[PDB]
Swiss-Prot record, chain A:
Full-protein interval shown: 1 to 107 of 135
Organism in which the protein naturally occurs: Anabaena sp. (strain CA / ATCC 33047)
Cellular component aspect of the GO annotation: carboxysome; cytoplasm
UniProt keyword annotations, A-Z: Bacterial microcompartment, Carbon dioxide fixation, Carboxysome, Chaperone, Cytoplasm, Photosynthesis
Protein's name according to its UniProt entry: RuBisCO chaperone RbcX
Domain notes from UniProt: The homodimer has 2 functional domains, a central cleft essential for production of soluble RbcL in which the RbcL peptide binds, and a polar surface which plays a role in correct RbcL subunit arrangement.
A molecular-function term among this protein's GO annotations: protein folding chaperone
Subunit details: Homodimer. Interacts with the exposed C-terminal peptide of RbcL ('Glu-459-Asp-468'); binds 1 RbcL peptide per homodimer. Contacts a second RbcL monomer via its peripheral polar surface. A slightly longer RbcL peptide binds to RbcX2 with a higher affinity.
Swiss-Prot record, chain D:
Free-text remark on how the cofactor is bound: Binds 1 Mg(2+) ion per subunit.
Documented EC number(s): 4.1.1.39
Family: Belongs to the RuBisCO large chain family. Type I subfamily.
Motif Interacts with RbcX2, chain ranges: 434-440
The protein's name in its UniProt record: Ribulose bisphosphate carboxylase large chain
Active site: 148 (proton acceptor), 267 (proton acceptor)
Binding site for substrate: 96, 146, 150, 268, 300, 352
Catalytic activity, as annotated: 2 (2R)-3-phosphoglycerate + 2 H(+) = D-ribulose 1,5-bisphosphate + CO2 + H2O; D-ribulose 1,5-bisphosphate + O2 = 2-phosphoglycolate + (2R)-3-phosphoglycerate + 2 H(+)
PROSITE patterns per UniProt: RUBISCO_LARGE
UniProt PTM: The disulfide bond which can form in the large chain dimeric partners within the hexadecamer appears to be associated with oxidative stress and protein turnover.
Amino acid sequence: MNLKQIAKDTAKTLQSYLTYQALRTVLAQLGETNPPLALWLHNFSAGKVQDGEKYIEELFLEKPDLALRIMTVREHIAEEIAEFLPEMVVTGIQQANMEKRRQHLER
Amino acid sequence: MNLKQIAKDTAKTLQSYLTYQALRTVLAQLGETNPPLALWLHNFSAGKVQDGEKYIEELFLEKPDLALRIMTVREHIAEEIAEFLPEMVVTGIQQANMEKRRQHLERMTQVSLSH
Amino acid sequence: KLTYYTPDYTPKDTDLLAAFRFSPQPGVPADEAGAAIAAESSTGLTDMDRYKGKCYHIEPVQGEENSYFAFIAYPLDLFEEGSVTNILTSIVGNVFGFKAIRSLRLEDIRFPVALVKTFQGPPHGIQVERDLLNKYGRPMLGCTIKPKLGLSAKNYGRAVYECLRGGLDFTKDDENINSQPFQRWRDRFLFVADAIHKSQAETGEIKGHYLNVTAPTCEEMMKRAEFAKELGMPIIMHDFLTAGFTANTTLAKWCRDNGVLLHIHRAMHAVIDRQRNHGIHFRVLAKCLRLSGGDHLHSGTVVGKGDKASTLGFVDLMREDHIEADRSRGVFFTQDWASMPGVLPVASGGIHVWHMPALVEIFGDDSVLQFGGGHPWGNAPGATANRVALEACVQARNEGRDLYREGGDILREAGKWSPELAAALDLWKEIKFEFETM
Amino acid sequence: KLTYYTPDYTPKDTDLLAAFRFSPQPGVPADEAGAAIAAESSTGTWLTDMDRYKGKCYHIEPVQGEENSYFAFIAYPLDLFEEGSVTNILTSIVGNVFGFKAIRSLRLEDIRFPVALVKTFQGPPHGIQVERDLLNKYGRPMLGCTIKPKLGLSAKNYGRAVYECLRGGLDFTKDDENINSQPFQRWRDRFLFVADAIHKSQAETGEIKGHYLNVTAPTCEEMMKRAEFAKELGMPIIMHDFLTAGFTANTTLAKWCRDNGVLLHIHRAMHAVIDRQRNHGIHFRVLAKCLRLSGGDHLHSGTVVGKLEGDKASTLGFVDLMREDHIEADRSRGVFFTQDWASMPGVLPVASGGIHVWHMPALVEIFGDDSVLQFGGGHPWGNAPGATANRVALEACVQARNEGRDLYREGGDILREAGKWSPELAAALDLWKEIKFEFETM
Amino acid sequence: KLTYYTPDYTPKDTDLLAAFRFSPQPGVPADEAGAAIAAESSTGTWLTDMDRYKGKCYHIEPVQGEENSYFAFIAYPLDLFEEGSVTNILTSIVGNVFGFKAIRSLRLEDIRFPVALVKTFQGPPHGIQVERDL
């Protein structure tokens, strides 16, 4: 019951988070390339980030080019870092669980 | 493309979110054994879920048993559900992205014919 | 066998050490490469054993397959004293063209203390410079005018004055402005001089502008540098790379002779230091500028991009007297400077005000925070915003506050005292990502 | 709303032009890139008519074959650039645009200097034609050679070796490019003894001799101190590392040379750091047009036979670019824009390193009469015989060409025959028992 | 409480070293002398870390045979000395320390110039090898 929809939701979350990460990449790439558009994008985006899939839908209605672009970026980041996350979140929590238990053992 | 940075962030965010989900697991299970604590933990954690280690530091200052319990729960979660993750994210993103482009192509041809 | 690969040689202190990263071509053994790189950069009646450059350690860069780190030792005799030019020519001249290597990149160099003692270095450097500018206890503010040409020197001069009177310490010449048909250099100098004199008097604070002396010929560069000296200007700037090390080494000695601070702009650096697999990394070049001469050096922005780990490293390298090897920060060998003074790192480009508390905590009081463009109210209020923002941060730190998890508040709070700072912050409605709770 | 990408703009003749090749990052469209590159190098800020100063990106095309690689053409107003200053040209073009986060890689491929700008530079202190009249060498390429080893050799002895060479029938000799003034060979001494070798050998051969003295130094002051003193000795030629020393320092030296009528050899130390990689940096083709402009009479173009194809076409191209007065744009030889020089003199390409005698006929057929064929290291009999060998081989080659023979198809014989007259040339040729591949027959 | 006599300090390579021989006046102990000599030639005044600049007297031994004669070894930070300037080296080492009322006699015996300092001097305009070729 748990793990099935625990992982299901976490996937939808990761999806949304990479979209934010795709946005912040397109921000910086535009930060140098087109300050005007970069400024516009940043202001428009503020707060929206919550849902990644709803965000593209919203951005499509405003400036479709930029919506498309983020889609290709999020796709590129996923394919190129996804395989490596399981070997990091596990060993990141395991490194945090051994370290915090050391603090409790002394004090 | 600064993937080294984008990986370490998704790791720390996923870790901060697997701390939140570990809290949901101990809350629903302790909801049947301690109604007063199921509300106590709900009150204490309200709006503090946005950081995994900022949450644990404050819970160690309150009840060390509750802090270690979440630590082992989030330990179990990642060791279990993390292996299937990447397959889901990518195919998920690609299924969605392909579909959003189709919708864009359908909104493209609807503006093409009206021109 | 090869006498250029000596796997047991322990470096003498007086040696010059170099760390290269290379991919050898299919078939080429690593030891052969490290040895050829050693041979070519050094030498090849043979009591020559003194002068040969030895390759004394090779290792594989973790992760990256077909990547090697080669350490080479050079004797103190190979290099002309005070010559950064000859240092380069001896190290980088030719080793980069080998058909047996797919790519070579120079990561680090340990300049021995005996060689360092033969360079002037910064004409003043951090410590001294403050005593001269009378600025203490905080990083120094500067900012870049925009655009370049299309502004009559009278206006550039008016624009500069707006900024210095707004509460800044420095303003800068757009780096590709030397002397073009519609802004001849001597005019710029006059009007910039006048902008300093006015604004300094009205504020009671030492004001500066990095006048851009960079020129076609050495003769011409000195003409500019010292007419700038004639005006009583406190600081001039130089594009050390596109101009050349020889041309600079020159200017830096002049600067010590005339007590004029030196602002070094790192133009063209991306052509060399960008690519991981090939070229010279910036940490090397940074050391060479410290060696040649310069009081400021653009170490680039930190808060954009790994960048961090590697940047903090060479910031340490251009500031400190002793630097412990620490590979994780990019520091390949321990480095002494033997009381040669440090160069003020300059954080340039891309940064607006929100970055302020980050920039303070990362860089500290010995840095220049350069702010090239744009505040909705003009140059002066922009300069005021950025000053208050900074003052607010220095004090927040000194009181003991956490500039990472508190930066937000620290600015929003002081934001209620400067309406100019208020409008600056208003411009950037921040984005934070929260995951779907409840 | 991007005014930095103008696909219809036809460039004015007085414009500066630049061809970049780039790999755009995932997501970035090509026109966004070319425009940003145009903006940054020019104005870039984003009541006047600024239009004059804004540099325009006027054409974009994808590289044939290569995926994710585009050529970007940009035009620059003549007003953007300070006169005689390559430094400023560089800082304006290559200053910043290479660092873009939205770019995987950037390589500058060619620049069209407008005649109107070319006219503001001195160029070579003498250049090909003048220098022949100065040295009295005509009708053949010029023979030089490098002495090995570097240090670990006293002035008296380096000088001795230089004499041995020049006397053996060579035009030129050169300092190792990392020889300036070290703890065991201070320049003042190297200069004394080299001068002595020239004077002696010159009187003994009855032929103009020269050695490229490396005035490359730490400061402009020091660099001049040496050139000044090489002049005092009546030396006809000095060398300078334009890249590691820098362009400002060079522009200075090249003027001084014209004022004192001293020939100026130019070694491109550290060029490989910039020009090696196909995907990033600046191509040597550009740096050569720059070295032409700043100043210099010779320039190391590297050999064309050690390195293989595609260097060939590209090198032939820029040899033409530094030699001729008008160069037709030819993409196949890597020449992006038609270049004029408005009677600015040509630079002698110098074919350096890794080449021995066997290469001789090839070198002559490729580079022709206006070249300097350097020969550093080694003949079994010493410097002089080695020099003689190389010299006779050359003389034999020129005449064989003038007689009308195929230096590719007949190179072998043209040498073997000449070898029956020079035992030194024999010894050298016989040192290389050459390899040929025939497939199995019968 | 004398920080100018440090018997355990092992000299750095970049240090300047100096060996004095002295006769201490009746009453004066040898360590008092070597320390004063160290102090005077260096800082000598008696919130910072001055330690860098203080010249340390690091070894003392009596001259074999000769009674009332000691060797005093002193180390000097590379930073004490102006470059190429023997004048400054002299003024720093032999400037004052020879006048001490608590000393019968002082003789400077040898100096170890560190390679790091040697490198700041031009030295002989030509020197043996060059001059033969000349």
